[PDB]
Amino acid sequence: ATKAVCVLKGDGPVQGIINFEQKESNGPVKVWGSIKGLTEGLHGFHVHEFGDNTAGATSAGPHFNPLSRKHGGPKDEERHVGDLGNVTADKDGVADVSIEDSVISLSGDHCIIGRTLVVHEKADDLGKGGNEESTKTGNAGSRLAAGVIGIAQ
Amino acid sequence: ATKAVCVLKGDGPVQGIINFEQKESNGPVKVWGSIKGLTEGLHGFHVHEFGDNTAGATSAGPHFNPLSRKHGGPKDEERHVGDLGNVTADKDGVADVSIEDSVISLSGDHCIIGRTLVVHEKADDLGKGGNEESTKTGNAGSRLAAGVIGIAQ
Amino acid sequence: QGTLCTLEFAVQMTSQSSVDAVRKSLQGVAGVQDVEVHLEDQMVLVHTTLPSQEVQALLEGTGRQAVLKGMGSGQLQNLGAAVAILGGPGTVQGVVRFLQLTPERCLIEGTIDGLEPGLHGLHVHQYGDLTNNCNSCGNHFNPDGASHGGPQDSDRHRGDLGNVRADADGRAIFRMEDEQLKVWDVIGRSLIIDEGEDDLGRGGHPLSKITGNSGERLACGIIARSAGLFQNPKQICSCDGLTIWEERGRPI
Amino acid sequence: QGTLCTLEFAVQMTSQSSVDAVRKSLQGVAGVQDVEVHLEDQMVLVHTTLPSQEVQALLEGTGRQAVLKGMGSGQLQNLGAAVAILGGPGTVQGVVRFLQLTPERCLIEGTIDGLEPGLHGLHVHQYGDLTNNCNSCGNHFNPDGASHGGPQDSDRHRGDLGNVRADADGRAIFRMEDEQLKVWDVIGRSLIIDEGEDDLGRGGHPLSKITGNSGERLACGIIARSAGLFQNPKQICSCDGLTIWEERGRPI
Ligand SMILES: [Zn+2]
Ligand SMILES: [Zn+2]
Ligand SMILES: [Zn+2]
Ligand SMILES: [Zn+2]
């Protein structure tokens, strides 16, 4: 898979479209898109382990973590594979997403295809807020909108 | 068993008789006897795990250690059950042994009956000589004389 | 790093001192996990990350010729599993689950509500692209370059799963096994249900050999990774040519 | 730690909220390892060091009647094993090994050289006191206060093992099973072989009902704890009412 795509949706007004592209085999992945309907400020942005959303974020489960580490920001050495940090939602409630990341992949053992991308309620504290919950979820709390990452043309 | 006895013997001139006595259930054990034929100075004095001397100290095996601890002197909290420290052999080569010890017993999980008592070549360093061998054997080295601890009248 | 398999070389071994020497060459070498030396078989199994070239040279460094005869990994794994949730404009909704029973047989089983009673085409499509409802999903999944067919045809699109029947109340319950479809080969692709019947290429219509003339695409989902019921196996004990594995079901 | 058995109480349990309450009383109390609650059986198994008094009071502290119906420990153990090495003043030397096959059946098997060919009494004696050669060892082992007998007699000394035959070259090879003798009950006692035949109490000698008139005691050893071929079992895996144990032979 060179390209992939995700369509975020939920119960609330949150919705959006995120693209992935990877040009080298175990190279970096460009992540880009838009999300309307958000509160202003920062929101957590995570690839969770499974794509099964029959039961919401209980079936999609935890942050995608094939190397059994603690939660962190994308720039940290100690992080989950799924940790892509935050997205900035402006005054109107739009976040123009743009990220580059070489820990996620579209192939191999860190392949995100078939897993659930999620925009969370609060901001990702990057594991630095200093408690048990900070090193699982970064206290971004509840799901706003989510979708399965699928293969794209 | 209230009383027990051991008859130490080898190929070389080392030989002796050690008695054990215990008056209270989980009480202390009086250990007393004599050993002739020793070099002057200090010699290690150990209850090893098994009494099987079909193959010497390889079949009798290690220091009797039901709590999987490191080797020590009798006075240490960290010790093998079998660790009774040293005996002082005089100029004539006799060690008149007299000891009290409340970690060995003649019953229960620390029962020494049926195991091999051994007088070793060098002195017991009490685990304090600072290497891997010091915390197995206390660098007392080879067996001089040994015998199975048996029930006595 | 380099990832570890188990390497099997065959060595002419006769005396216990030869075996002493073979173990000697791999005893505590950088990156060799475990060595095992079946002297009845005249064989040396090597649990290691290292390349076959390098490891053959260390055995041959003693002075014995070491012919490699196999590589394997006694790691065990679960059957693969997946789920697609179908949604779209309006009434049609459903869940379809996939389970790879054998590496040659996939089990598909699901439930789709809000269908105009009778037969509807069900197909795996190429892309998991829900950007433009079900029209962004591309064609029937067809990596072998076959012509469209029904599930009882050798020549067909991998993605061709034939039809499902909506009952009285507009609801399709179905189970099926398919031998060309494979869960590992469709994660991230899409499942789509259609307006009307797939003709299985037997319509003599221009679309027959291409879509089976199935109509508008009503509802689609992405074929998504699901947790199994069971956790990943765990080795609890090993020996020479034996491993013992535990497999516990998931909590919840 | 070492006093860790498993306690079974029977409790009137009906709803899942009652079971929630039972677990509640033992959830994280000092010194309770594991709790397990078969609601079909209306029963609560408690892996704990604590006394049965104390644990019954914690269950009854909720207000629920907790009748104890059993205790056990699913710890597993090896069959017990022992060896005696026979030496003395004179010519005679030998090794005799013991293995407790079943808790009712002991296997004795050994080899004794330097014997005047024919039948010799073999007996376990009371004390493992080798201070005065074989004469400090006391009588035939007789905790049940029986009269001396042969191994085919119910009324006999536990220590009575009858006779063994020294062949042509003055060597006795023998196997026997004995149902009254038990390895755990003779560790630290002595095995002794005799100058001549044990008459099995059928000699009409004053010693018949006491020693079987067997003669001088030639050689003796203490019945000593032996390592046995196999290591202590190890639990490798558990669940609710199942444990899996490994048992490996000793290396050397
Ligand atoms: Zn994380
Ligand atoms: Zn020691
Ligand atoms: Zn097709
Ligand atoms: Zn008798």
d(CA C137, CA C127): 5
**Touch criterion met for C and D (3+ Cβ pairs within 8 Å):** yes
Nearest CA to D166 among D60, D94, D229, D220?
D94
CA dihedral D23, D26, D31, D32 (to 10 degrees): -30
d(CA B134, CA A93): 70
Q: Which residues of B137-146 are buried (b: 16+ CB within 10 A; e: fewer)?
A: bbbbeebbbb
A48 is catalytic: yes
Grouping H, G, I as helix, E, B as strand and the rest as coil, residue B106 is coil
Catalytic residue (choose from A11, A43, A90, A143): A143
Experimental method: X-ray
Q: Which residues of C78-87 are buried (b: 16+ CB within 10 A; e: fewer)?
A: eebbbbbbbb
According to DSSP, residue C116 is labeled -
Contact B66, B47 (CB under 8 A): no
**What protein residues have CB closer than 5 angstroms to ion ligand 1?**
A 63, 71, 80, 83
Grouping H, G, I as helix, E, B as strand and the rest as coil, residue B122 is coil
d(CA B97, CA A142): 75
**Contacts of A121-126 spanning 24+ positions with Cβ under 8 A:** A121/A39, A121/A43, A121/A44, A122/A43, A122/A44, A123/A41, A123/A42, A123/A43, A123/A44, A123/A86, A124/A42, A124/A43, A124/A44, A124/A45, A124/A46, A124/A73, A124/A83, A124/A85, A124/A86, A126/A71, A126/A72, A126/A73, A126/A76, A126/A85
Q: What DSSP letter does each residue of C125-156 carry, written as one string?
A: ES----EEEESTT-SB--TT-PPP--TT-SSS
Q: Which of C237, C240, C245, C250 to mutate to test the interface with D (most CBs of D within 10 A)?
A: C237
Query: What angle do helix axes C52-60 and C16-26 make, rounded to 10 degrees?
Result: 140
Contact A39, A86 (CB under 8 A): no
Ligand 4 centroid – CA B18 distance (Å): 29
d(CA C122, CA C135): 15
E strand or H helix that includes residue C52 = helix C52-60
Grouping H, G, I as helix, E, B as strand and the rest as coil, residue B30 is strand
CA-only gyration radius of chain C, Å: 26
Contact C134, C87 (CB under 8 A): no
Q: Which ligand is nearest to the CA of A74?
A: 1
Instruction: Report the gap between the CA of A57 and the closest CA in chain C (Å).
Output: 12
E strand or H helix that includes residue D22 = helix D16-26
> Nearest chain B Cα to D94, which residue?
B54
CA-only gyration radius of chain A, Å: 14
Angle at D184 between CA D183 and CA D185, to 5 degrees: 90
Cβ–Cβ gap A5/C189 under 8 Å: no
d(CA D129, CA C62): 56
Contact D163, D197 (CB under 8 A): yes
Angle at C176 between CA C174 and CA C180, to 5 degrees: 145
Other beta carbons within 10 Å of D177: 13
| Contacts with D83 from chain B: Cβ below 8 Å | 51-52, 54
Q: What DSSP letter does each residue of D50-68 carry, written as one string?
A: S-HHHHHHHHHTTT--EEE
Nearest CA to A59 among A18, A139, A116?
A116
| Contacts with C133 from chain A: Cβ below 8 Å | none
Checking chain B for breaks where C and the next N are over 2.5 Å apart, the residues before them are none
Region for D16 from its dihedrals, namely left if φ exceeds 0, alpha if ψ lies in -120 to 50, beta otherwise: alpha
According to DSSP, residue A111 is labeled B
Structural domains in chain D, CATH included, are 5-72 (3.30.70.100), 81-225 (2.60.40.200)
d(CA B22, CA B106): 7
The answer, for C244 touching chain A at a CB cutoff of 8 Å, is no
Instruction: Report the gap between the CA of A94 and the closest CA in chain C (Å).
Output: 18
Contact A142, A121 (CB under 8 A): yes
Owning domain of residue A57: 1-153
According to DSSP, residue C23 is labeled H
The answer, for C222 touching chain A at a CB cutoff of 8 Å, is yes
d(CA D222, CA D187): 8
Contact A113, A151 (CB under 8 A): yes
Angle at C235 between CA C229 and CA C240, to 5 degrees: 145
Q: Which of C234, C246, C247 to mutate to test the interface with D (most CBs of D within 10 A)?
A: C246
Contact D46, D26 (CB under 8 A): yes
CB nearest C224 (choices: A7, A148, A152): A148
The two three-digit tokens of residue D115, written as one number: 């014997």
Ligand 1 centroid – CA A36 distance (Å): 23
d(CA C198, CA C32): 56
With a CB-CB cutoff of 8 Å, which residues 202-241 of chain D face chain C?
Answer: 236-237, 239
| Contacts with B19 from chain D: Cβ below 8 Å | none
> Is B83 assigned a ligand-binding role in the annotation?
yes
Other beta carbons within 10 Å of C220: 25
Q: Determine how β-strand B143-148 pairs with β-strand B116-120.
A: antiparallel
Other beta carbons within 10 Å of A68: 6
Number of domains in chain B: 1
According to DSSP, residue C249 is labeled B
B46 is catalytic: yes
Nearest CA to B143 among B41, B33, B8, B6?
B8
d(CA B121, CA D202): 52
Nearest CA to A72 among A146, A139, A4, A138?
A138
Other beta carbons within 10 Å of C102: 10
Ligand 1 centroid – CA A71 distance (Å): 4
Paired with C173 in beta bridges are C111
Using CB atoms, list chains with 3+ pairs below 8 Å to chain A.
Answer: C
d(CA C189, CA A51): 12
Nearest CA to C125 among C107, C105, C106, C148?
C148
Region for B138 from its dihedrals, namely left if φ exceeds 0, alpha if ψ lies in -120 to 50, beta otherwise: left
d(CA A123, CA A139): 7
d(CA B26, CA B105): 7
Nearest CA to C25 among C81, C66, C73?
C66
Catalytic residue (choose from B43, B110, B115, B120): B120
Nearest CA to B6 among B59, B82, B79, B91?
B82
Catalytic residue (choose from A46, A79, A110, A115): A46
Tell whether the torsion through CA atoms of D46, D52, D55 and D56 is positive or negative.
positive
E strand or H helix that includes residue B138 = none
CA-only gyration radius of chain B, Å: 14
The two three-digit tokens of residue B133, written as one number: 């061998």
The helices-and-strands tally (H runs, E runs) of chain B is: 1, 9
Cβ–Cβ gap C130/A7 under 8 Å: yes
The answer, for C187 touching chain A at a CB cutoff of 8 Å, is yes
Q: Determine how β-strand C171-178 pairs with β-strand A83-89.
A: unpaired
The two three-digit tokens of residue B95, written as one number: 């060690």
> Binding site for Cu cation: which residues of A?
46, 48, 63, 120
Contact B19, B78 (CB under 8 A): no
Q: What DSSP letter does each residue of D163-226 carry, written as one string?
A: EEEE-TTSEEEEEEEESS--HHHHTTSEEEEESS---TT-S-STTTTTT-S--SEEEEEE-EE-
Q: Determine how β-strand D105-113 pairs with β-strand D93-102.
A: antiparallel
A43 is catalytic: no
Nearest CA to D180 among D152, D220, D208, D206?
D152
The answer, for C227 touching chain A at a CB cutoff of 8 Å, is yes
Ligand 1 centroid – CA A15 distance (Å): 22
- Tell me how long chain B is: 153
Using CB atoms, list chains with 3+ pairs below 8 Å to chain D.
Answer: B, C
| Contacts with D237 from chain C: Cβ below 8 Å | 236, 246
Residue with tokens 């398919």: C178
CA dihedral C147, C149, C152, C153 (to 10 degrees): -20
Paired with C217 in beta bridges are C194
d(CA B68, CA C1): 36
Paired with C105 in beta bridges are C102
Contact A35, A19 (CB under 8 A): no
Contact D162, D156 (CB under 8 A): no
Sheet strands side by side (includes D105-113): D171-178, D105-113, D93-102, D81-86, D224-225
Burial class (CB in 10 A: 0-12, 13-18, 19+), D72: exposed
Other beta carbons within 10 Å of C24: 13
Distances (CA, A) of C140 to A7, C37, C128: 21, 52, 12
B110 is catalytic: no
Cβ–Cβ gap C237/D239 under 8 Å: no
Q: Determine how β-strand C105-113 pairs with β-strand C171-178.
A: antiparallel
> Binding site for Zn(2+): which residues of A?
63, 71, 80, 83
d(CA A9, CA A31): 18
